[PDB]
Design an enzyme around this catalytic site. Structure first.
Site, PDB file in Angstrom:
ATOM      1  NE  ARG A   1      -1.701   1.564   3.720  1.00  0.00           N
ATOM      2  CZ  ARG A   1      -2.660   2.706   4.003  1.00  0.00           C
ATOM      3  NH1 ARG A   1      -2.315   3.760   3.125  1.00  0.00           N
ATOM      4  NH2 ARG A   1      -3.731   2.822   4.558  1.00  0.00           N
TER       5      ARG A   1
ATOM      6  CB  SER B   1       1.825  -5.733  10.543  1.00  0.00           C
ATOM      7  OG  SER B   1       1.749  -6.930  10.856  1.00  0.00           O
TER       8      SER B   1
ATOM      9  CD  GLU C   1      -6.350  12.871  -0.334  1.00  0.00           C
ATOM     10  OE1 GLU C   1      -6.470  12.796   0.789  1.00  0.00           O
ATOM     11  OE2 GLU C   1      -5.131  13.443  -0.630  1.00  0.00           O
TER      12      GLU C   1
ATOM     13  CD  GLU D   1       1.630   1.737   5.920  1.00  0.00           C
ATOM     14  OE1 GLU D   1       0.976   1.230   6.786  1.00  0.00           O
ATOM     15  OE2 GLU D   1       0.757   2.615   5.579  1.00  0.00           O
TER      16      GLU D   1
ATOM     17  CD  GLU E   1      -1.263  14.063   3.546  1.00  0.00           C
ATOM     18  OE1 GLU E   1      -1.918  14.003   3.849  1.00  0.00           O
ATOM     19  OE2 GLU E   1      -0.800  13.522   2.381  1.00  0.00           O
TER      20      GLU E   1
ATOM     21  CD  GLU F   1      -7.464  13.974   3.695  1.00  0.00           C
ATOM     22  OE1 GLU F   1      -7.064  15.005   3.130  1.00  0.00           O
ATOM     23  OE2 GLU F   1      -6.368  12.998   4.133  1.00  0.00           O
TER      24      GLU F   1
ATOM     25  CG  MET G   1       0.592   6.786   0.015  1.00  0.00           C
ATOM     26  SD  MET G   1      -0.464   5.924  -0.925  1.00  0.00           S
ATOM     27  CE  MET G   1      -1.302   4.879   0.408  1.00  0.00           C
TER      28      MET G   1
HETATM   29  N1  LIG Z   1      -8.774   1.817   2.582  1.00  0.00           N
HETATM   30  C1  LIG Z   1      -8.642   2.857   1.370  1.00  0.00           C
HETATM   31  N2  LIG Z   1      -9.170   2.413   0.186  1.00  0.00           N
HETATM   32  C2  LIG Z   1      -9.367   3.642  -0.774  1.00  0.00           C
HETATM   33  N3  LIG Z   1      -9.040   4.567  -0.541  1.00  0.00           N
HETATM   34  C3  LIG Z   1      -8.335   5.130   0.483  1.00  0.00           C
HETATM   35  C4  LIG Z   1      -7.955   4.048   1.599  1.00  0.00           C
HETATM   36  N4  LIG Z   1      -7.462   4.678   2.729  1.00  0.00           N
HETATM   37  C5  LIG Z   1      -7.204   5.869   2.405  1.00  0.00           C
HETATM   38  N5  LIG Z   1      -7.677   6.175   1.104  1.00  0.00           N
HETATM   39  C6  LIG Z   1      -7.770   7.608   0.110  1.00  0.00           C
HETATM   40  O1  LIG Z   1      -6.723   8.439   0.600  1.00  0.00           O
HETATM   41  C7  LIG Z   1      -7.056   9.441   1.464  1.00  0.00           C
HETATM   42  C8  LIG Z   1      -6.150   9.509   2.388  1.00  0.00           C
HETATM   43  O2  LIG Z   1      -5.069  10.282   2.102  1.00  0.00           O
HETATM   44  P1  LIG Z   1      -3.745  10.209   3.000  1.00  0.00           P
HETATM   45  O3  LIG Z   1      -3.861  11.265   4.232  1.00  0.00           O
HETATM   46  O4  LIG Z   1      -2.579  10.527   2.185  1.00  0.00           O
HETATM   47  C9  LIG Z   1      -3.406   8.745   3.628  1.00  0.00           C
HETATM   48  P2  LIG Z   1      -3.729   8.065   5.057  1.00  0.00           P
HETATM   49  O5  LIG Z   1      -5.133   7.665   4.729  1.00  0.00           O
HETATM   50  O6  LIG Z   1      -3.674   9.076   6.140  1.00  0.00           O
HETATM   51  O7  LIG Z   1      -2.850   6.785   5.593  1.00  0.00           O
HETATM   52  C10 LIG Z   1      -1.411   7.006   6.052  1.00  0.00           C
HETATM   53  C11 LIG Z   1      -1.412   6.173   7.452  1.00  0.00           C
HETATM   54  O8  LIG Z   1      -2.319   6.502   8.525  1.00  0.00           O
HETATM   55  C12 LIG Z   1      -3.382   5.270   8.402  1.00  0.00           C
HETATM   56  O9  LIG Z   1      -2.944   4.702  10.041  1.00  0.00           O
HETATM   57  C13 LIG Z   1      -2.850   4.276   7.356  1.00  0.00           C
HETATM   58  O10 LIG Z   1      -2.792   3.079   7.963  1.00  0.00           O
HETATM   59  C14 LIG Z   1      -1.278   4.441   7.076  1.00  0.00           C
HETATM   60  O11 LIG Z   1      -0.570   3.976   7.799  1.00  0.00           O
HETATM   61  C15 LIG Z   1      -8.469   9.243   1.824  1.00  0.00           C
HETATM   62  O12 LIG Z   1      -9.004  10.464   1.755  1.00  0.00           O
HETATM   63  C16 LIG Z   1      -9.085   8.107   0.611  1.00  0.00           C
HETATM   64  O13 LIG Z   1      -9.491   9.186  -0.515  1.00  0.00           O
HETATM   65 MG   LIG Z   2      -4.112  11.176   6.211  1.00  0.00          MG
HETATM   66 MG   LIG Z   3      -2.294  12.778   0.943  1.00  0.00          MG
HETATM   67 MG   LIG Z   4      -4.169  13.293   3.663  1.00  0.00          MG
END
Ligand SMILES: Nc1ncnc2c1ncn2[C@@H]1O[C@H](COP(=O)(O)CP(=O)(O)OC[C@H]2O[C@H](O)[C@H](O)[C@@H]2O)[C@@H](O)[C@H]1O
Ligand SMILES: [Mg+2]
Ligand SMILES: [Mg+2]
Ligand SMILES: [Mg+2]
Ligand SMILES: [Cl-]
Lengths: 205, 202
Positions: B49, B126, B155, B132, B105, B157, B91
């Site tokens: 991922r 893990s 996104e 990851e 972010e 959010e 990400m």
């Molecule tokens: N399960 C999923 N399936 C489809 N789309 C998804 C999924 N999870 C997130 N996304 C997409 O990415 C965006 C999050 O972006 P980041 O903000 O860029 C990323 P973030 O979510 O925050 O991840 C960073 C860390 O926090 C969590 O613990 C995760 O496990 C990871 O280790 C969300 O708004 C969604 O559009």
């Molecule tokens: Mg995030």
């Molecule tokens: Mg992002």
């Molecule tokens: Mg984000």
């Protein structure tokens, strides 16, 4: 009737509706797609949101700690997924195992202590339970500290796939800080131990 | 400590089982045993991922932490609620540095403009089922301006910011009220290094 439970966040389990769950891929671990709607912070209901979820499970993690000698027993084993972002896929870890139907975290931890490290745990104590990466996986790991006699270590069941290392608590902590121990379960367990060793040593005294 | 390196593993193949937003890969390999011999072929299903940049917003002057709230549906089945208290996290895309992602972010998810930043720890969530890697950084912020709902619209959010003292956040972690790995690791680290950090920044 009963008053509602207190939450540290804004919404509770009742503020989201899981419309459907579909298996996107079924293998040892399934990758699912959740379709759901939830309340937004502005008070409004969301559109249907879709998320891909890796249904990994539930694990038991045990930190073998010898309070008298102030030592920890770590196990060395390969974790192939660590290959692309580490210098070696062989990691120093905690005793751990997956938990299945009818099993308790403690039962699995005690059994793994014997199978992976040849240790017989005495008292155990719940430490913390964490979600490894809740943004994409359902995995949940429960950590416990297990009282052991490091004398009995350093021949175990899984000795050709797992190698046991007995080191001082302080040495183990140092490796975490240096980045020589970097898998979540171990880092969390060792930081916790570094924050609570004195009280735990007196507790098990 | 550990003696076996990448030359002690023979990656026979890495296949893609599934490819969507995330990918699911199969690793077929042989690895050396602690008795010196090579194992039979082994298969492992690995969740691919990408990697994450994590930012712990810390106000050294007020000794407070800025936490973000948002729903994580994957926590539903094993948690009291899917809404988690977490650290800013994003990400890492095509050739972006941990710092660029963490700072970007922080504006995106919490509307915070981080000042000085410092690396903390980088961990594998893990190593058993996912590749990851999450890299944590601590960022100096002014907590008195952290507030409201944020997150990217494109996104989708929906993120709410919470400001709490460092001690409270730490107690919530030991109490299990904050239990996602990145936050637990970052906050126990803060609890173990807060005095040195306040001394440096405050
Ligand atoms: N399960 C999923 N399936 C489809 N789309 C998804 C999924 N999870 C997130 N996304 C997409 O990415 C965006 C999050 O972006 P980041 O903000 O860029 C990323 P973030 O979510 O925050 O991840 C960073 C860390 O926090 C969590 O613990 C995760 O496990 C990871 O280790 C969300 O708004 C969604 O559009
Ligand atoms: Mg995030
Ligand atoms: Mg992002
Ligand atoms: Mg984000
Ligand atoms: Cl409830």
């Amino acid at each position: 009737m009963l008053k509602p439970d207190n939450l540290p966040v804004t919404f509770g389990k009742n503020d989201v509706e899981i419309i459907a769950r579909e298996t996107l891929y079924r293998g040892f671990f399934s990758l699912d797609l959740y379709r759901f709607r939830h309340r937004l912070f502005n008070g409004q209901m969301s559109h249907e949101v879709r998320r891909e979820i890796f249904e990994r499970g539930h694990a038991a993690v045990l930190l073998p700690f010898d309070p008298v000698r102030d030592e920890v027993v770590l196990i060395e084993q390969i974790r192939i997924a660590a290959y692309d972002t580490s210098e070696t896929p062989w990691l120093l870890e905690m005793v751990a195992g997956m938990i299945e139907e009818g099993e308790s975290v403690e039962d699995v931890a005690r059994r793994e202590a014997i199978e992976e490290a040849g240790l017989i745990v005495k008292r155990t104590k719940p430490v913390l339970s964490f979600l490894a990466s809740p943004g994409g996986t359902s995995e949940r790991s429960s950590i416990m500290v297990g009282e052991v006699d490091a004398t009995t270590a350093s021949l175990a069941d899984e000795n050709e796939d797992i190698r046991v290392h007995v080191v001082s608590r302080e040495q183990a902590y140092q490796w975490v800080e240096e980045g020589k121990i970097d898998n979540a379960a171990s880092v969390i367990a060792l930081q916790w131990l570094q924050l609570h060793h004195q009280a735990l040593k007196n507790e098990w005294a």
